[PDB]
């Protein structure tokens, strides 16, 4: 994304496609490496009543 406009134009002409729309090099658009802590849900068997294992 640091390329000049002339190099971008030559690159797009020789490739035939708009390469700047879909760049293969990742930038600040991806998610952060530090995330807030999660809270995962529990399954259907996490019940206090009517939870007999033989059923």
């Amino acid at each position: 994304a640091s390329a000049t406009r002339l190099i971008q134009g030559l690159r797009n002409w020789a490739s035939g496609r708009d390469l700047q729309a879909k760049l293969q090099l990742r930038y600040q658009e991806i998610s952060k490496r530090t995330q807030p802590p999660p809270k995962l849900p529990v399954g259907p068997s996490h019940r206090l009543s009517n939870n007999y294992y033989c059923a």
Partner: protein, 176 residues
């Protein structure tokens, strides 16, 4: 539900015939391939500068093994032999005896780093988070015998990498 790759009949009118013959005689698609490889020349390469730049990793990464301690100096392993029972490669050897104050502690804890497949079953079978797979991966040795860790080597690895292993465990323990 399905599609017909390569079932396009060629047109037989003079326009299509002259287009195909001009493509044959003047080498159009060869110029297309040349030009696109030229366009790929003028892009910034994806090469990082190792060892000054490192590839991205995750807190779940499985590298070198380590033995942890409680936040009082006492080691966490209580010689329950679950890690050597679950080890798919039989890389762990454990021998235990009661020590001087009667605690249940190991006297021998060997991990063969040439047998281990780095699968992480031991760190998830541990009930006390004693054995871990640390984030270190650059530990190549010049000798085979340097890859046969005893208890002292693993304890030293834990003391060396605690400040990172504890942070990775703090980041990941809510997904377990």
């Amino acid at each position: 539900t399905y599609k017909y790759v390569n079932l396009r009949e060629p047109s037989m009118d003079m326009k299509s015939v002259t287009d195909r013959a001009a493509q044959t005689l003047l080498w159009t698609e060869l110029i297309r391939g040349l030009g696109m490889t030229l366009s790929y020349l003028f892009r910034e390469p994806a090469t990082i500068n190792y060892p000054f730049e490192k590839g991205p990793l995750s807190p779940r990464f499985r590298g070198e093994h380590a033995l942890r301690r409680y936040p009082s100096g006492e080691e966490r392993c209580i010689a329950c032999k679950l890690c050597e029972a679950v080890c798919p490669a039989q890389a762990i050897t454990i021998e235990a005896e009661p020590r001087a104050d009667g605690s249940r502690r190991t006297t021998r804890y060997d991990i063969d780093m040439t047998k281990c497949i780095y699968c992480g079953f031991c760190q998830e079978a541990c009930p006390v988070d004693a054995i871990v797979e640390g984030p270190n991966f650059e530990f190549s040795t010049e000798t085979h015998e340097e890859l046969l860790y005893n208890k002292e080597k693993l304890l030293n690895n834990g003391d060396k990498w605690e400040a990172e292993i504890a942070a990775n465990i703090q980041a990941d323990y809510l997904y377990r």
